């Protein structure tokens with residue numbers, strides 16, 4: 339199947355990405371606390387629901403939250419300010435809190451059931467968010483011997499996410515608060531800049547955007 343692209347809300351960031359975030363791929367954003375990773379996730383969860391000529395995929399969303407940072411009212415605000423019904427947009431986000439890394443891994447396997455259910459509806463799942471991908475792994479696997487064990491478990495988790503992305507034509511979007519190896523398709527470094535701006539760079543030009551009542555924008 340042909341790749342789809344989801345606008346981030348920022349023309350600058352969209353250009354950096356080659357046209358938006360891709361289905362059949364895992365895009366990882368990483369950066370320090372406060373760099374805007376979760377705001378970008380909230381914005382994408384709205385943008386994907388737009389029709390294709392407006393930068394979306396007529397898609398639904400699955401969101402796995404490891405830090406209790408999902409904010410339904412932020413979704414509703416972004417949606418309303420972009421002309422979408424806030425309650426319809428929120429209804430199309432399936433939401434789950436992951437309690438630990440083993441639960442997080444099960445939830446990805448569990449997500450396949452809803453993906454299959456919605457696959458031939460008018461709003462199939464097109465975006466799967468894991469925010470944060472790494473927080474539970476970092477807290478649980480620590481000390482001598484943990485590097486190999488943590489990386490091996492993360493590799494399996496990412497393999498599961500790659501399979502869902504590739505098999506069901508979904509964009510997987512993951513966040514990472516930051517010499518270790520990484521298995522995401524594309525890695526985007528986010529940081530704070532001057533004037534409240536955020537700056538994004540591809541890892542392995544730079545886009546600049548603001549966090550606004552519309553989520554993110556130029």
Ligand SMILES: c1ccc2[nH]ncc2c1
Pocket residue numbers: 400401402432433434445446448449452
């Ligand atoms: C991941 C994210 C959201 C979800 N809702 N139901 C199952 C599930 C898995």
